[PDB]
Design a protein around this ligand. Sequence first.
Ligand SMILES: [Ca+2]
Ligand SMILES: [Ca+2]
Ligand SMILES: [Ca+2]
Ligand SMILES: [Ca+2]
Lengths: 269, 269, 269, 269, 63, 52
Amino acid sequence: MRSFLNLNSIPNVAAGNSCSIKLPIGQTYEVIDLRYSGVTPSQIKNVRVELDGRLLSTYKTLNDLILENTRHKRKIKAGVVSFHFVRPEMKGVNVTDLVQQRMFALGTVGLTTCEIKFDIDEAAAGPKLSAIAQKSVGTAPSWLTMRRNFFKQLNNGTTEIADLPRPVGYRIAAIHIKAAGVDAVEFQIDGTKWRDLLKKADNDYILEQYGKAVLDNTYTIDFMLEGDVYQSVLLDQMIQDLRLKIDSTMDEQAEIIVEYMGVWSRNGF
Amino acid sequence: MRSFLNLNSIPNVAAGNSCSIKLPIGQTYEVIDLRYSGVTPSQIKNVRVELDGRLLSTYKTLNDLILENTRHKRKIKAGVVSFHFVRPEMKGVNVTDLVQQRMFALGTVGLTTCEIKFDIDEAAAGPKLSAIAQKSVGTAPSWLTMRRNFFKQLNNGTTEIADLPRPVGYRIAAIHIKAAGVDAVEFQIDGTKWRDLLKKADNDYILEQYGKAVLDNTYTIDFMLEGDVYQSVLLDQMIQDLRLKIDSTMDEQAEIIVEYMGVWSRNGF
Amino acid sequence: MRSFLNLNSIPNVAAGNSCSIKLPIGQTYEVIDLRYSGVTPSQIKNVRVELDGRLLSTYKTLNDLILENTRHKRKIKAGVVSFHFVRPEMKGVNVTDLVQQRMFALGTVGLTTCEIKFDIDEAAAGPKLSAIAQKSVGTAPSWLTMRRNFFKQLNNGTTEIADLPRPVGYRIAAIHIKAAGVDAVEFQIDGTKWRDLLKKADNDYILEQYGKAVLDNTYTIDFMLEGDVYQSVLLDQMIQDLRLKIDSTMDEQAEIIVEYMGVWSRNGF
Amino acid sequence: MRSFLNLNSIPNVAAGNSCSIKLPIGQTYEVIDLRYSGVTPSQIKNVRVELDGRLLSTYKTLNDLILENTRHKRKIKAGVVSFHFVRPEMKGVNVTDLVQQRMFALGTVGLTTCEIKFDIDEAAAGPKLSAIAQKSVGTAPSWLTMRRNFFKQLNNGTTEIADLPRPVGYRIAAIHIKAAGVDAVEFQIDGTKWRDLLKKADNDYILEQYGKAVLDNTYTIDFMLEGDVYQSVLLDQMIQDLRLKIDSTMDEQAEIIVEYMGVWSRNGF
Amino acid sequence: VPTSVPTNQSVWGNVSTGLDALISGWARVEQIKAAKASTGQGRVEQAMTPELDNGAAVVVEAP
Amino acid sequence: TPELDNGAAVVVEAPKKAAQPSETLVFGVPQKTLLLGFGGLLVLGLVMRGNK
Ligand SMILES: [Ca+2]
Ligand SMILES: [Ca+2]
Ligand SMILES: [Ca+2]
Ligand SMILES: [Ca+2]
């Protein structure tokens, strides 16, 4: 049996304020529903999920969480944005789908602090935020999704990005290139071309082919289209080159979103 | 390695409001830089540094903190005022200067609450306050500077102040007599005249002789001119009389500032 | 007792010429005073301090040495520029200040060659250069400051620099970002944010707070503000990420100055 | 704890009079602040510091004491001149800076008489002199600074001075050549050139480089620029030649000031 | 024994008994901090510690 | 005692009492241990009868 709780009131919710959603340790958080009003998702900046003071996932703005859910075609409702720790799209290969989905839940056992920090923009009309938690029996943080942010200059022609962090033992579920002039992209590991120079139209077709929604000004490289976790990139310690070849038509600054995965460690990634 | 952090936003910063700078427990605070605008230092009243709800240091107004720093000839910048817990002027006798200076840092280990409370004047134009922390590895509160406020009547002639608190085991770094008509002062302990009836001009000359700046309408009795902590007044549990003989020319109420020192105790001074 | 010597005449001092200050091996060079006339400090390009043919420190122009001294508020005189091997700002933690400062002196014992090479610009009016040496008893090169030059392009937005050399066992005293449009910078090691995204005004305030002078079009990250060498960045081998997040307002190429430190080695950095 | 005392009234202070500041024996005098009015420092001639009737330090006029303090950049105030027995510029090598500075304090233990004699010029308008003493616990005279006066004829060309007293076991902190036409000076001991023929501009640059102020018509040879007492000249009994080679441009009478140092002895230097 | 008297006293108590014993302890802990800073393992230990509010817990059910 | 908005709570069910399982085990092992004692005391008692 699951428990649906109305989380404690969020302290000091005001424009230009730096608030935090401190989660009580002991149980497992499958989903966290954040209700907002008097403020836009884009006005909720620097969203950081921290476990024991360490960063787990980061969102430039709350709007990126809305887009994250939209991509998987999850239920979207105005005035509310959810933190899906449990991945509903997961499919089991040697275990049940339910086990593969729940495995991403945010367990808090052994933790000292679990927080969701963020800053409220100064322009916020009259910010009002509350949270509801869909919890289950306590478990260690264990297997978690680690959303990381990266910024890189994209040229008009060809750009290559090979300096992406490769935490050992971790995996990569997907890579999102946020740019308006990306025509095609190619992904390779150690010379091996796992993703040919696929045109945007072709890449976006495959994405939609798997029930995903294409995000505006984004080139998504989904390594878990089938929902199988073992299709994602396994960051082996021996990998010598993890490269991305981007064919752009514009000279701009791209925000590269990398969805990492791995067993949470107090002194790990 | 030290860590420079942009402290969390100060809640409810407005004219006539009572705000507080709640410091996170765990590490050591060497210096706290408070940026202000839309308000004068004199408009930031009743500044209190509290450890576990108890009073450590007190400032009638933020301007007294500016004067405290000015006296030691510390870097002063408009729009910013720092809380120097670590005393940069300290000199070691049997230890290094660095050890003697850092020994005053605000350790928070074992603490339940660390706060810097203050009241914003109603006349404040458009108060705006933020804080930055220069921290280091965690330590117990230990040796701290305890600025205390006292108000006493001065006569035109000779006034004597012998009712100053004498917390056992504690020390006195300095005494600041805030009055406009003080000509000369004499300090004695148990009949012994440690400071002869020194004329203001003579006392102020010795102060400047040690790199200190003379404050307006203030007679400072610096017991740590050399930076040696062992030169300060040791409040021996055996002292029978701690007296101050003030020769004034005006009949006014003086604000006596006493800079105490000692190992912070949950049930101490 | 120290010895002040008028170094041998500098051979072939003329415009467009490549000269060198060959130092006699045997003793220790604490300071080298270089007198110049008929030429500007900016006209003395590619200044290199070489020990046994290997590069120790490098200056794009002699003006960078003038700025290096200005930053520490060292005595600056027109027509003369000094090479401060001994760091006067050093403070001892478990040793005397004098020992900590002299430890940076340029010992020459065991050396085959000690040189200070540089090129005289062609536009030089009538170059005239002489040098004086403040020496002391001979010592091995030992602990030395190794000024390194790096050029990186900056965007208008955020730029990240994580490819800075990390010689094992060495330390980093400071990092100077030479750019005209830097608003704020953030420094982190292995995810740990040792320096929050500090605004220039805030960073510069802390610098001045420690007796340092802010250099024009430069964002200095001083890791030895207190003079304590053990506050500097220890380039520990297990370090996986040494990153710099620069928030600029201009699209330019910055000159990154890194002040390394370590025991000089025939086969080291 | 130190004691600040208003010394007894100076007997017979009048123009053309020979007065004396008789110091009470028992404690240690770190500093003596002499307030003057109705007379110029140059009008206070033949200042002699005598211990047990023997001469310790000598000043042609009180103005030389003002210049002595100015050179070290000590606090100078009109109407007051201090006798700094404790040397604030001292830095410890194997002891703390404080110990190295206080070691020069004027201890009086074992003394029969401690006096500061001087003559008041006849032209003195209306001489008024008082003194304040900054004392500490009693100690033997011990290590003291012994300022000695010497007069020698300087030629236009080259002059050599090798007849300077060399009290065995004593040291030389500095040598001040008071002449208006000195271009360069060279210092050597037993043929060894410890100070090359340094041009005034070059010598003065090094002086300022160490926080010292250059005195008018003076060529200072500071042997304690770092504040290290062990950098001074140690007058070994074996020294065969202590020479000074002065390159002047004028034919004049120079006043050579020699700052000696050593453990005070009732029958010593 | 305590006594009251004017004038600068000839001999004063220059004893810093219990305060010096404490001051040495502060000097000792400074060397411990420096011992950590001299190695890379000392910096990584300090990275684990944050400064935040207190944490609560709650649980029920039969596993 | 101060006033802050920072508390560390721990509200949870707790079990009480336990009878029968530890007993049954702690009655089995000593009864056997006692029975071994009687066997030793019997053979010592019976051998004394042989020495009559
Ligand atoms: Ca999990
Ligand atoms: Ca402390
Ligand atoms: Ca060295
Ligand atoms: Ca002495």
